[PDB]
């Protein structure tokens, strides 16, 4: 995913490998010029999920799923059953611990397992 | 049948103790230390509501008391709810400032008998 | 720095306890004449007159006139009934109160460190009325943003600073060793004054290695569990110890263990 123009004729160069040279080289078919490569890099692409361009807004691809909700747990500050539970790591602890967030709009209370 | 004895999940750190988190835990022990009020609330609810130790409120209070006892072992706060406060105390207590209500349970009868014997 | 001499630590601690008590004011005991008189005398007579002054029913205004008008065993006590003189300190948000060398039952940690009897001090964090600290005085809740987040008060930072920096009394600086399970429920903690011979970390590593425990509460519990009153007995090496396997039963998907802390003993060991 990289390209450069040789100074001799200002044309694109294609990478190639030589067994005897054992070094990356760039030469073009337009003119006869071989130049030494830099950093030994022939491809560098950041992985992205922007494949369905101009299509993720109409059809809901569900890129960010919604957190599950449960009604078995009962809140402490208020007597509301609906709550949001998820797993996340602590500040310094290891593993996944279950958390809870109250769904009452007037409560705004969160507690651990 | 007895209640479940399974405790909370232990919390394990990724690094050794630097003598600071222990101080944080020691200071935070005072905060949210509701060990002494759960028993009083359970006694008040048992004296007020008939058929005590049968409703779900008593089970919740017992679970909270067990968690509070386990707080000294594992860092799991009791999280005492606000709506569970009794806001009323029977005769056989030293909370003179708090409102006092006449109890008609077995404890009330025993306290009345003791008062009559003393007088 | 005002004294700038070789004044003994015990007399200075007793004087501080007197000042903290409602007996003598700060300036009434900071004069040059009083320290000059109390510098060179008999130690036992000085302790006797100091405790007699402490036992005064009313407030003393002139200590100089009062003191003018007035005029080994620790190891045996520990081996007999575990009797030690432990200093007790009360830390309040406003000031600090020193009760003094009150007699109390000795624990295991002082059996092998009986020489530093005065280095051990009990520190309890109480309110101004010497009562328990209310929950509203530490980490008062406040609603900031979408969720409520507790806000630490200045008393929280003061307690943290006291625990970290330590308490300095005379030519000593006490350090945090550990706290027992009973002391955890009463907001009490042990403090040991560091010395050139044995320091707080030396005692901490002598008790055991606690880096294996990765739980904050479990590590503190294991470090403070070895502070209960006990009677000294003979010493047994680590050559004759059994490893009897235990029994475990798993029913209904629940782990039930019969042997939690049970053990086995012989008749000769019981007789000894
Ligand atoms: Zn070219
Ligand atoms: Zn709620």
From Swiss-Prot, chain A:
Example of a GO biological process term: DNA-templated transcription
A GO-annotated cellular component: nucleolus
Record: residues binding Zn(2+) 1: 6, 9, 28, 31
Description of the deletion phenotype: No visible phenotype; due to the redundancy with NRPB9B. No effect on methylation at RdDM target sites. Nrpb9a and nrpb9b double mutants are embryo lethal.
Zn finger (TFIIS-type) location: 71-112
Keywords: DNA-directed RNA polymerase, Metal-binding, Nucleus, Transcription, Zinc, Zinc-finger
CDD domains: Zn-ribbon_RPB9
UniProt signal peptide: none
A molecular function GO annotation: zinc ion binding
Summary of the function given for this chain in its UniProt record: DNA-dependent RNA polymerase catalyzes the transcription of DNA into RNA using the four ribonucleoside triphosphates as substrates. Component of RNA polymerase II which synthesizes mRNA precursors and many functional non-coding RNAs. Pol II is the central component of the basal RNA polymerase II transcription machinery. It is composed of mobile elements that move relative to each other.
PANTHER family in the record: DNA-DIRECTED RNA POLYMERASE (PTHR11239), DNA-DIRECTED RNA POLYMERASE II SUBUNIT RPB9 (PTHR11239:SF1)
Subunit structure, interactors included: Component of the RNA polymerase II, IV and V complexes. Interacts with NRPD1.
Further comment found in the protein's record: Pol IV and V functions are not impaired in nrpb9a mutants and Pol II functions are complemented by NRPB9B.
Name of protein: DNA-directed RNA polymerases II, IV and V subunit 9A
Organism: Arabidopsis thaliana (Mouse-ear cress)
Lineage: Eukaryota, Viridiplantae, Streptophyta, Embryophyta, Tracheophyta
Gene field: NRPB9A
Curated annotation (Swiss-Prot), chain B:
Coiled coil segments of this chain: none
Intracellular or extracellular location(s): Nucleus, Nucleoplasm; Nucleus, Nucleolus; Nucleus
Segments traversing the membrane: none
Mutant lacking the gene: phenotype: Late flowering and absence of siRNAs derived from FWA tandem repeat regions. Loss of de novo methylation. Increased expression of retrotransposon-derived solo long terminal repeat (solo LTR) and SDC due to their derepression; levels are even higher in the double mutant rdr2-1 jmj24-1.
Family the entry assigns: Belongs to the RdRP family.
Subunit record text: Interacts with NRPD1 and SHH1. Associates with Pol IV complex, forming an interpolymerase channel bridging their active sites, through which the Pol IV-generated transcript is handed over to the RDR2 active site after being backtracked, where it is used as the template for double-stranded RNA (dsRNA) synthesis. Interacts with JMJ24.
Function: RNA-dependent direct polymerase involved in the production of small interfering RNAs (siRNAs). Binds to single-stranded RNA (ssRNA); engages ssRNAs longer than 7 nucleotides and initiates internal to their 3' ends. Able to transcribe the RNA of an RNA/DNA hybrid, the transcript produced by Pol IV, if its 3' end is accessible, to generate double-stranded small interfering RNAs (dsRNAs) precursor essential for establishing and maintaining DNA methylation.
Record's miscellaneous remark: RDR2 is non-functional in the absence of associated Pol IV.
This protein's name: RNA-dependent RNA polymerase 2
Encoding gene, per UniProt annotation: RDR2
Interval of the full protein contained in this chain: 851 to 969 of 1133
């Amino acid at each position: 995913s990289t390209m450069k123009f040789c100074r001799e004729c200002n044309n694109i160069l294609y990478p190639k490998e030589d067994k005897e040279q054992k070094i990356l080289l760039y030469a073009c078919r337009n003119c006869d010029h071989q130049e030494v490569a830099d950093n030994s890099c022939v491809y560098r692409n950041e992985v992205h999920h922007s494949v369905s361009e101009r299509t993720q807004i109409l059809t809901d691809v569900a890129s960010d799923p919604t957190l599950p909700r449960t009604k078995a747990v009962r809140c402490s500050k208020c007597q509301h059953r609906e709550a949001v539970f998820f797993q996340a790591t602590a500040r310094g602890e290891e593993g996944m611990t279950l958390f809870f967030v109250c769904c009452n709009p007037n409560c705004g209370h969160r507690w651990r397992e | 049948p007895p209640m479940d004895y399974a405790g909370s999940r232990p919390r394990l750190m990724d690094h050794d103790v630097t003598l600071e988190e222990i101080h944080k835990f020691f200071v935070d022990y005072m905060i949210s230390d509701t060990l002494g009020v759960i028993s009083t609330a359970h006694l008040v609810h048992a004296d007020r509501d008939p058929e005590k130790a049968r409703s779900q409120k008593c089970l919740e209070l017992a679970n909270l008391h067990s968690r509070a006892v386990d707080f000294a072992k594992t860092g799991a706060p009791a999280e005492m709810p606000y709506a569970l406060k009794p806001r009323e105390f029977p005769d056989f207590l030293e909370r003179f400032e708090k409102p006092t209500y006449i109890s008609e349970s077995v404890f009330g009868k025993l306290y009345r008998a003791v008062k009559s014997s003393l007088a | 720095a005002i004294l700038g001499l070789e004044f003994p630590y015990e007399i200075l601690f007793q004087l501080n306890a007197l000042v903290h008590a409602q007996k003598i004011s700060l300036f009434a005991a900071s004069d040059m004449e009083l320290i000059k008189i109390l510098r060179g005398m008999s130690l036992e007579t000085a302790l006797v007159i100091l405790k007699k002054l402490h036992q005064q029913s009313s407030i003393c205004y002139d200590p100089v006139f009062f003191v003018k008008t007035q005029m080994a065993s620790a190891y045996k006590r520990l081996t007999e009934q575990n009797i030690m003189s432990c200093q007790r300190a009360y830390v309040t948000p406003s000031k600090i109160y020193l009760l003094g060398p009150e007699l109390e039952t000795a624990n295991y940690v002082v059996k092998n460190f009986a020489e530093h009897v005065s280095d051990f001090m009990r520190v309890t964090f109480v309110e101004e009325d010497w009562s328990k600290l209310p929950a509203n005085a530490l980490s008062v809740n406040s609603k900031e943003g979408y969720f409520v987040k507790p806000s630490r008060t200045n008393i929280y930072n003061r307690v943290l600073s006291i625990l970290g920096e330590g308490i300095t009394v005379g030519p000593k600086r006490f350090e945090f060793l550990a706290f027992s399970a009973s002391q955890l429920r009463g907001n009490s903690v042990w403090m040991f004054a560091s010395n050139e011979k044995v320091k707080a970390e030396d005692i901490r590593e002598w008790m055991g290695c606690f880096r294996k425990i990765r739980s904050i509460s479990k590590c503190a519990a294991r470090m403070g569990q070895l502070f209960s009153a006990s009677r000294q007995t003979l010493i047994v090496r680590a050559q004759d110890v059994e490893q009897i396997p235990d029994i475990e039963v798993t029913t209904d998907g629940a782990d039930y263990c019969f042997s939690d802390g049970i053990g086995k003993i012989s008749l000769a060991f019981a007789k000894q």
